[PDB]
């Protein structure tokens, strides 16, 4: 045989501790470089001028932060959507002043997660499985891409992306609420229903399966020891569990098929997350949620308020105080 | 620079040379095993996946 | 005539029709 | 027994329902259109939010004298 | 700065070529039902 | 003896006309700005 | 009946259109019927938009997405972007509506009455999903048709009336493009450009000559490729890398169409040459630049010298410098300094905005355009309110740019999901384990322990 | 407004654009007619 | 035998719906709570307590109607129909806000009855009662917020209102006044909820993508007899796949399902503690060190201070209309505001 054939046989081998595959060639370097840069920048980075008004903001541990308030600041507003690699700065100090590491981390990270999906499919193929797990994983990837890349593209600046921090996430959420009126977009309601229903069904399924265990342990050992690796037993007792579910609610509602059950379980949260990601992506292009301000009037013509007006007051309060020194003109276009 | 529109970001000869070096090195390694292919009408197949050895 | 299902379904159904009629009537009110 | 799948078919079911349901629907319509709900529940009418004397919102300020306060605020 | 760009381009093209020529080496045949 | 694919059609017509009426009332009348 | 039940093919009713994979007679009818539906919608939408036209408001204040394309092609538009007549739109709608009937009848016939398979009486119109020569032939034929279409667009742009040009010397007007650019360096620098800010990849075309030259080159390339793929068969390096089945081809098409949808949405959002602003409305950056220009003009008229006015941060209230040196508008709109519009270029010199021209060379029409674009920014809500999120119900307007961008972005993402699903299934079925794990010979049980 | 010779047909024109959806609903109706064979 | 035995035999018979002894507590209270919400969102107003319109009869839609809390002048009254505030007079009872108390009070007992029903059915069929600890989670959430939060505050007026937009108002209100996102208990609740959603999706795709070939048609749904002895999917293949992709994987089928049960309930029970803490204004608002440094050094800035400024803006611009009974009057010159807008 040749050298290339041996290399290919080693790459696609299903006997290593961790599968490599051809997608792993793009996966591993990008994720590793993103991790290294993120750790170093989170620990020891200097303040970054995020808004382009020459007012740097500290975000690293060594400059007086804690775990909660630390972050990696997005790039400067003066840059916009321009590409800013290291070799385009006159010095490393200038590169760090304008928020260089954010772009590097984000780009290598997104490439890494795409390769992660590909690698999942590849191992599924090599193991003789059915190839539909990476489709399920595509939803968190879609949401992360939506925020990190799509929102800056629509708004025209990397500085509007979500900061890589804990309190930066809250700041992003609050400003997004103030500017786009989320919580009134039906796609956000779809996402909330998705997560709540996912938690509900996880708890219900766990309870039902755990309650229907046959007797193999008696008292003085954890019940988990009954199951053996490779044992043959369907994940319930049909009589007890089916009767319990058919008696708890009306008898017409009971899943007697494991396939349909475990399909519904997979389908619900994935669809919810897809819809909420598309909601964020569409709101990136200034298509906001429902507007119900001053919609109820009496006979004379005066305005009677509703709860939407209280929400509007909160939105105005958030809006008038964000980026205090950044605006010069009456409209925030 | 940043705002200019050069192809693939190439602004110097050395960048092009090293790109050629990379594609060509991996290409030579690949040709070390797939370089003896023929287009004769007996190496073809009738199916969805090519199992005809090399 | 007095089964449990009768009582449940009618107790859930009569006010539903009443309220739906009320809402449809509300739809044509103008100030 | 006698499930819904063939309950939906019985002709007597259909005829008694056609006799009964429209009466309830019209009763609800008349309940709204007569204006009786405004008096039962105390909801102000579209021309009753502000009276000629009171031009502000009528908030209740006392616990044990809510009856007299509401009687004042409504019309008096 | 120029040398850093040279090295980064080298690494990127190397890994991308690895990917491209790896998927061209009769990949659909590498399944357990061969 | 209605078959079990026409009564569902009647129910669908009823629900769709109710929803359409509610949307129209949303666009016209009380609470329409 | 055979071929239309689960017991004979699997494929329960909710996935019944998958029973047509190996039936080449009904598939033709299905595809023709969908084409007829598309033509019908085009004609009906044109007619509906024509019926509601009002000659006072601009086209972007009436919620139209179909009249703008015909107007850009040079039908019924005059100087400055005013609509003069609507007869050609009526003619286009009528022709589409009439052709839809023929297409639908053909689909219905070929689907309900014609032979189930064409591989027994019409050998020319037959295939096997695995005969590579036939697939290449079909691809080449329809590719040559695409090239002919591109050349037809070029011919319309050059000889048959001309196209609307928003950069015309004296305001937008219909003119003949007599000198298209043909130097391959420019076109293939457009193709091989980076997509980030300042470059924009192919969205950044900013004149009609480049557009016509590009469509010329595309026509030439498509014709040549069609002939080549007709007269040849796939080479060795391609045979060992692809999967040869119908679902694989479907997934291949799905990925490309998703990419095209993304590209079109970004065209609609950012470009203002093929989507002139007089018809679709101002772009995102354009409204902010207009606001800055309007307030600069007002403050200068009041008496200020707007070159040395200091802002709250000391950076410059009206004018400043971009990170490369050019003079740009101040404020939060420093991110949109890449904008180029026909109503701003009169004030731009060799190094950005010109101080003297700004001082004493601003015409009233520019002021009016700036005010209009400032007050008609692309911001709105789902129920068509218009304005910032904290505004009250007074106007009813959402720009067509937002609608087009959001819709085709949604479609692009879901068709990418299509690539993933249909391709994974195609490859798994080709390998032979899409039904499940063979319990007799589970492959995992014969691997070295980990 | 449509050309004067066709203004009478305006109500039909106001309904054409939505026809392509009724087709999608008709597919489900046809499937339900044969009892989801 | 006696009356007790006959009634007990009748109550546990196999019917369309199980009734049981707990049905007496469950059915009336739940029915009354649902009916109260349905009539409140349709006919009753909030004009005299909040100064708002919150019914269909006034012009609201599904997303803006609610059953609002009672007036602030009635601190923690039980608001009985025959109490010293209404003294009968259904109309005055509706006008002062008795429907909210009606709904909450009968609904708490409805929840208790549902938990008792779960216990009873589990005992009847002879299985361990694990679906009654999983429901205790949501019981803790409801009790904690809807009862303990108002009881520590001034009055019932500061409770969530039964509506869609009222809940959004509640969220924004707690963020603005308590800095609720910074509390380390909502954090653990978020972690629990998101982990539950993740677990639900990964299992159904893992189970659905390791099925044994037990059929001949592409529709794998009709390849499962209602219950057999063999498992429908391969545990070994799933273990291998997930241990070679992620580096760690499950191997015990009981631990998997117990983990699925455990995560979200733990999240909810954790968030309840933080809400109970907020009830007494014992919040996690300030980092004193950063406040001191920012006061001394007028160049130190993090995202923390920006969030603080946002909260100040929320409070100042919302309090005037959110609490109409305080007669707040803020001149335009005292409202905090940035430049331009
Ligand atoms: C291909 C590589 C894909 C990765 C792209 C990421 C960055 C895309 C980007 O910043 O895209 C923006 C560019 C548009 O570029 C803009 O192009 C503009 C062109 O306008 C110029 O030209 C116009 C012509 O009149 C006007 O004159 C205008 O004033 C003038 O500025 C400017 O140059 C802007 O600075 C520049 O940002 O679009 C594009 O490159 C074209 C579209 C690329 C394909 C779409 C990318 C895929 C979608 C993003 C990924 C989604 C992932 C989630 C999916 C789930
Ligand atoms: C199932 C969910 C979808 C059904 C929604 C309910 C249908 C009826 C309600 C509705 O629709 O609403 C009723 C409206 C008709 O209402 C009229 O809609 C008008 C729309 O305004 C338009 O016209 C105005 C001036 O005419 C302005 O120009 C404004 O910008 C422009 O949008 C105004 O709001 C009128 O006041 C109002 O009466 O139906 C419409 O418009 C008809 C169009 C609906 C089908 C079009 C598909 C949606 C367009 C693709 C968008 C993809 C979504 C984005 C990506 C996600
Ligand atoms: C664009 C949409 C579209 C199209 C073109 C088709 C086309 C087709 N489907 Mg299909 N399908 C669709 C959507 C579509 N489907 C959807 C959404 C579903 C899910 C509900 C299905 C579910 C489905 C199943 C389950 C099956 C098909 C089958 C078929 C094929 C035979 C149908 C047949 O025998 O008709 C029989 C129907 C009739 C005789 C009644 C309809 C008569 C006409 C068409 C009504 C319309 C006439 C029109 C209004 C008047 C035009 C006049 C003109 C002169 C202008 C055919 C190629 C079958 C197949 O594979 O066959 C091998 C099959 O088993 N489909
Ligand atoms: C892409 C479009 C398309 C394609 C590939 C076909 C292909 C075909 N059609 Mg068809 N057809 C179409 C659109 C199409 N049709 C439309 C739109 C209509 C409506 C006007 C018809 C109406 C139609 C009729 C009425 C008949 C066909 C027939 C045929 C077959 C023989 C054609 C022949 O001998 O011409 C050879 C031409 C050049 C070599 C062939 C399979 C015939 C058939 O199959 O009869 C059994 C036939 O009688 N077609
Ligand atoms: C819709 C557009 C389209 C599609 C799908 C294809 C598809 C294909 N082309 Mg093709 N081609 C096209 C347009 C297209 N071509 C055009 C417009 C040209 C002219 C520039 C060419 C010039 C071309 C050449 C020169 C070759 C291909 C080849 C191929 C095959 C392998 C391509 C690959 O894996 O990369 C594949 C069947 C290769 C092949 O297999 O040869 C038969 C090959 O050598 N194509
Ligand atoms: C299981 C049945 C049940 C239960 C537990 C409750 C529980 C409640 N209801 Mg309710 N209610 C019910 C059925 C029920 N309801 C039904 C069926 C109706 C319709 C007729 C009502 C109509 C109703 C109204 C109209 C009101 C309540 C109210 C209340 C609350 C206070 C009641 C009170 O003071 O208790 C009183 C305690 C007792 C009566 C103890 C019972 C007496 C003992 C057993 C015997 C003593 C004999 C003595 C020596 C003589 C409480 C949460 C009030 C409320 O929510 O205010 C906010 C209120 O105004 N209920
Ligand atoms: C489909 C994919 C087929 C390829 C399979 C390989 C997938 C590999 C995954 C791609 C990762 C490699 C991306 C790194 C390259 C990079 O970021 O370049 C980033 C460079 C930007 O280059 C920057 O340019 C600046 C401008 O002056 C400066 O010069 C900077 O120094 C320079 O770095 O952009 C490009 O090279 C883009 C050119 C190619 C884009 C058009 C593609 C042509 C074909 C279109 C079809 C695809 C759409
Ligand atoms: C006024 C004084 C009224 C006291 C009468 C109670 C009679 C119970 C006798 C019944 C009796 O003798 O039989 C004992 C009874 C079982 O009744 P059976 O009818 O099955 O029994 C018949 C025989 O088996 C023996 O009684 O046991 C019970 O469950 C006790 C009842 C619960 C307790 C009920 C009383 C508590 C509520 C009192 C009402 C409140 C008043 C204030
Ligand atoms: C018209 C026009 C224009 C344009 C022009 C042109 C010329 C274009 C071109 C275009 C083009 C020219 C495109 C191309 C593309 C390509 C592609 C898109 C490719 C892809 C690839 C692939 C897909 C592959 C894959 C793979 C791999 C990776 C390896 C192995 C495996 C496989 C094979 C799968 C302009 C702008 C000037 C102006 C306007 C008008
Ligand atoms: C409070 C009170 C009370 C009680 C009352 C009651 C009990 C009532 C009931 C009531 C009721 C019980 C009512 C109900 C109503 C209902 C309704 C109103 C419904 C509606 C519906 C709808 C509208 C739906 C919708 C939908 C959905 C959701 C989905 C699908 C689609 C549709 C559209 C169908 C009494 C007497 C004790 C006295 C004291 C006070
Ligand atoms: C153009 C034109 C026209 C028209 C025509 C057309 C083309 C039409 C046809 C077509 C159509 C337009 C048809 C449609 C129909 C549809 C329907 C009406 C459907 C219904 C639906 C439903 C009701 C459904 C339901 C259901 C069922 C049954 C079962 C399952 C579930 C569901 C819910 C889905 C005319 C004559 C005027 C003449 C002039 C021109
Ligand atoms: O960068 Mn971030 O936050 Ca979107 O609004 Mn305008 O720009 Mn600024 O202000 Mn508001
Ligand atoms: Cl600004
Ligand atoms: Fe399991």
Numbering used by the authors:
A (entry chain a): 11 to 343
B (entry chain w): 178 to 231
C (entry chain f): 13 to 43
D (entry chain e): 8 to 83
E (entry chain i): 1 to 34
F (entry chain j): 6 to 38
G (entry chain c): 21 to 470
H (entry chain k): 8 to 44
Passage from the reporting paper:
Diatoms rely on fucoxanthin chlorophyll a/c-binding proteins (FCPs) for their great success in oceans, which have a great diversity in their pigment, protein compositions, and subunit organizations. The light-harvesting antennas of the diatom PSII belong to the LHC family, but they bind Chl a/c instead of Chl a/b, and a large amount of fucoxanthin (Fx) instead of β-carotene (BCR), to harvest blue-green light; hence, they are called FCPs (fucoxanthin Chl a/c binding proteins). Lhcf proteins are the major antennas for PSII, whereas Lhcr proteins are mainly connected to PSI, and Lhcx proteins are considered to be mainly involved in photoprotection, as some of the Lhcx proteins have been found to function similarly to the LHCSR proteins in green algae. We report a unique structure of photosystem II (PSII)–FCPII supercomplex from Thalassiosira pseudonana at 2.68-Å resolution by cryo–electron microscopy.
The structure is a dimer and shows a unique organization, in which one monomer contains a PSII core, one FCPII dimer associated at each side of the PSII core, and three FCPII monomers. Among the two FCPII dimers, one is a homodimer composed of Lhcf7 and associates with the PSII core through an Lhcx6_1 monomer. In addition to the protein subunits, 191 Chls (183 Chls a and 8 Chls c), 29 Fxs, 10 Ddxs, 2 Dtxs, 22 BCR, 2 pheophytins, 4 hemes, 2 plastoquinones, 2 nonheme irons, 2 bicarbonate ions, 4 bound chloride ions, 2 Mn4CaO5 clusters, and 69 lipids are assigned. The unique organization of Tp-PSII-FCPII is largely different from the C2S2M2-type organization of PSII-FCPII isolated from another centric diatom C. gracilis, or the typical C2S2M2-type PSII-LHCII of higher plants, or the Tp-PSII-FCPII particles solved by EM and PSII-FCPII in two diatom species solved by in situ cryo-ET, in that the major FCPIIs in Tp-PSII-FCPII are dimers in contrast to the tetrameric or trimeric FCPIIs or trimeric LHCIIs found in other organisms. The LHCX-type antenna Lhcx6_1 was found in the PSII supercomplex and located close to PsbX, PsbH, and D2. Lhcx6_1 interacts with the PSII core mainly via D2, PsbH, and PsbX and bridges the Tp-Lhcf7 homodimer with the PSII core. Lhcx6_1 binds 11 Chls and 3 carotenoids; most of them are similar to other Lhcf subunits. Thus, the Ddx/Dtx cycle and Dtx-dependent NPQ component may respond to stress in the Tp-PSII-FCPII supercomplex under high-light conditions. As shown in Fig. 2 (A and B), Lhcx6_1 is located in a position between the Tp-Lhcf7 homodimer and PSII core, and Dtx303 in Lhcx6_1 is located in close proximity with the Chl a402-c403-a406 clusters but is deviated from the direct and efficient pathway for EET via its Chl a401-a407-a408 cluster. Therefore, we speculate that this Dtx may serve as an efficient energy-quenching site in Lhcx6_1.
